Design a protein around this ligand. Structure first.
Ligand code: SAH
Ligand code: IDI
Length: 261
């Protein structure tokens, strides 16, 4: 019944707690922002994660997870359980009034990528390759998509801070991973980002209860769902980024491959 709590979920409050200074201050490489974008950039740069279609699970109201990604997939599908978020994304996609400012992220994605690309061009490419923003439920065996417009099976998947924050225990987590794994074409690629050993986090009036997992549980979960863990790293949250919006211990990045056998 996490969904009950997600009802009071305030996108703007979420964005302010996680993507605005101090966490959203991308000057200083020892930060989470830099590190997350770095993991993403380095993985795609290997040019092994490629194709035509891509799906972002539980996008929430953020876009940074697709910045380096868009350069490799012409058809990008963003998703999220809450409508308030799907709406929040739209303000940025359609450049509506009061959309969130991802300038800094776009810029650092461009710095890290080193293609001499300007942020305006990248944001333009992301907004372009994002075809639709569909509603999704990782808890359903067929992720809120009975006959979804999304091209299936996707050639790759990306998820940042979703699963751990939607499931109440390690088992839900595992099943949710299985669910989404079904959307991934065999031999496909998965880029998983999430909170390590986190139990709760605020988002306005909402107070989400989440499953504290470990780099090892996640790895196992990945292997159990039928993946070849290509890369798995962990960033330890510094004291300075430990504000009172949650109790994260660290953050993990996972590059997994749907092993086709
Ligand atoms: N059952 C469910 N299935 C999929 N997404 C869900 C869900 N229940 C809640 N969510 C959404 O999953 C998100 C997790 S937190 C936001 C994650 C975002 N990718 C980021 O990095 O900031 C929230 O936006 C929440 O509304
Ligand atoms: I750093 C970072 C980014 C996103 C989120 C958290 C921490 C903690 N709560 C889930 C959302």
């Amino acid at each position: 019944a996490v969904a009950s709590a997600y009802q009071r979920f305030e996108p703007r409050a979420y964005l302010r707690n996680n993507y605005a200074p101090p966490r959203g201050d991308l000057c200083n490489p020892n930060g989470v922002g830099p590190w997350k974008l770095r993991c993403l950039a380095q993985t795609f740069a290997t040019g092994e994660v490629s194709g035509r279609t891509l799906i972002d699970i539980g996008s929430g109201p953020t876009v940074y997870q697709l910045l380096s990604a868009c350069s490799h997939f012409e058809d990008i599908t963003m998703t999220d359980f809450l409508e308030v978020n799907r709406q929040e994304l739209g303000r940025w996609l359609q450049e509506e009034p009061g959309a969130f400012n991802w300038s800094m992220y776009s810029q650092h994605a461009c710095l890290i990528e080193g293609k001499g690309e300007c942020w305006q061009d990248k944001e333009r490419q992301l907004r372009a390759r994002v075809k639709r923003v569909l509603p999704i439920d990782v808890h359903q065996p067929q992720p809120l998509g009975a006959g979804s417009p999304a091209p299936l099976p996707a050639d790759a998947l990306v998820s940042a801070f979703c699963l751990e924050a939607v499931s109440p225990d390690l088992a839900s987590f595992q099943r949710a991973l299985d669910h989404i794994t079904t959307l991934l074409r065999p031999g496909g690629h998965l880029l998983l980002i999430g909170a390590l050993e986190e139990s709760w986090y605020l988002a306005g009036e909402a107070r989400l209860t989440v499953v504290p997992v470990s780099e090892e549980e996640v790895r196992e979960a990945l292997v159990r769902s039928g993946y070849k863990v290509r890369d798995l790293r962990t960033y330890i949250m510094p004291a300075h980024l430990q504000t009172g919006v949650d109790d994260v211990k660290g953050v993990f990045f996972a590059w997994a491959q749907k092993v086709g056998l």
